[model samples]
Target: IVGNIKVLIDMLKMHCGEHHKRPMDTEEAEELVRQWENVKAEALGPTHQVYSLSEVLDESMLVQWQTLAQTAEAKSCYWRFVLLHLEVLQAHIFEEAAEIEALLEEAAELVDESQPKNAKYYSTYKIRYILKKQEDGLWKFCQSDIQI
Candidate 1:
């Protein structure tokens, strides 16, 4: 159910998109992103070797190693790179703010305007969903509250 479809769902949230038939606002759409993001990872992680991306991007893993391995330079590099690619969209959305517009222009080339709707929700295995956002423009991970 994930794959690139989840990417669209995430984008829909970012742009304050409406569900063709069901309209929604920016805050509510973002809330959906907060809820479905983890499920997207669990759903699509194994469809390709990109599972590693899921593991690295996982909000949960950040808890134990969020400090970036202060004792080891290699670990720091590894963690940094891993985290960057894991939730690249999220990084663009939250971090290095103001990059989303440019990044969206770049992403336009890869995403097809035509595709089966709801494809991201057609997975075989069962998975849970969780979403949350903050009033102060802070997006926190589900497992912890470090605020990102």
Candidate 2:
């Protein structure tokens, strides 16, 4: 379901935008983190569930987010910007499995006034997601891989 995946990606963008807001709202940021975990839990089925982004992305990426969130909360500062654009490149549906490939264009600024030159980063990457049909006849994301 291409539409379904699109909705999921949209939700992701919204959550990320909220999380990256400047003058960080510690309570709301924590709530957003919990909401993200809920989304992962719901989108993944029992048979092929992945509980954390660490399963899909580099473990260091997860660590980075955690460290950033903590540091932002402590300092009352947040990342200055985050831009994400997603384009679906391919979608294939099978009897029991489905696959979707998307291109992600992202630009982010950490806003470290102390190091202005190193604050901004931008990249384009490709991501592939695999979904499996559950016992309840619902498609759920099972695995994902990314290439940059």
Model 2: per-residue Cα lDDT over 30-114, one tens digit each: 3333343344332231222233534332333334433334434443323433335556666666666666666666554443334
Clashing pairs in 2: none
Model 1 local distance difference test score: 0.28
Regions more than 4 Å wrong, model 2: 1-83, 111-118, 135-138
- Against the hidden reference, what TM-scores do the models get? 0.21, 0.38
Error of 1 at 111 (Å): 33
Top TM-score model: 2
lDDT of 1 by residue, 43-113 (tens): 32322223332333335533323222221222111111111111222222322121110011111211113
Worst 10 residues of 2 by lDDT: 41-50
Q: Estimate every model's Cα lDDT from 0 to 1.
A: 0.28, 0.44
Best lDDT among the predictions, by candidate number: 2
Instruction: List where candidate 1 sits over 4 angstroms from the true fold.
Output: 1-62, 74-131, 144-148
Provide C-alpha RMSD values for all models, in order. Answer: 17.0, 15.0
Error of 2 at 76 (Å): 9.0
